[PDB]
């Protein structure tokens, strides 16, 4: 089961920041993870 939701650039950003969209609650459009979301994870979580 892999229901990840994140922009084509975000998936790369989180993927780079060691963050996984699975651990992030995207709030974009239909709940898609934004680069801001990724940063928020590492900057809090």
From Swiss-Prot:
Organism ancestry: Bacteria, Bacillati, Bacillota, Bacilli, Bacillales
Quaternary structure (record): Forms a 60-polypeptide structural core with icosahedral symmetry.
Record protein name field: Dihydrolipoyllysine-residue acetyltransferase component of pyruvate dehydrogenase complex
Organism field: Geobacillus stearothermophilus (Bacillus stearothermophilus)
Protein family per UniProt: Belongs to the 2-oxoacid dehydrogenase family.
The Peripheral subunit-binding (PSBD) domain, residue ranges: 5-42
Entire-sequence positions represented here: 126 to 170 of 428
Top-level taxon in the UniProt lineage: Bacteria
Function in brief: The pyruvate dehydrogenase complex catalyzes the overall conversion of pyruvate to acetyl-CoA and CO(2). It contains multiple copies of three enzymatic components: pyruvate dehydrogenase (E1), dihydrolipoamide acetyltransferase (E2) and lipoamide dehydrogenase (E3).
Encoding gene, per UniProt annotation: pdhC
């Amino acid at each position: 089961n892999r229901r990840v939701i994140a922009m084509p650039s975000v998936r790369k950003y989180a993927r780079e920041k060691g963050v996984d969209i699975r651990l992030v609650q995207g709030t974009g459009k239909n709940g898609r993870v934004l680069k801001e979301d990724i940063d928020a994870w590492l900057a809090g979580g």
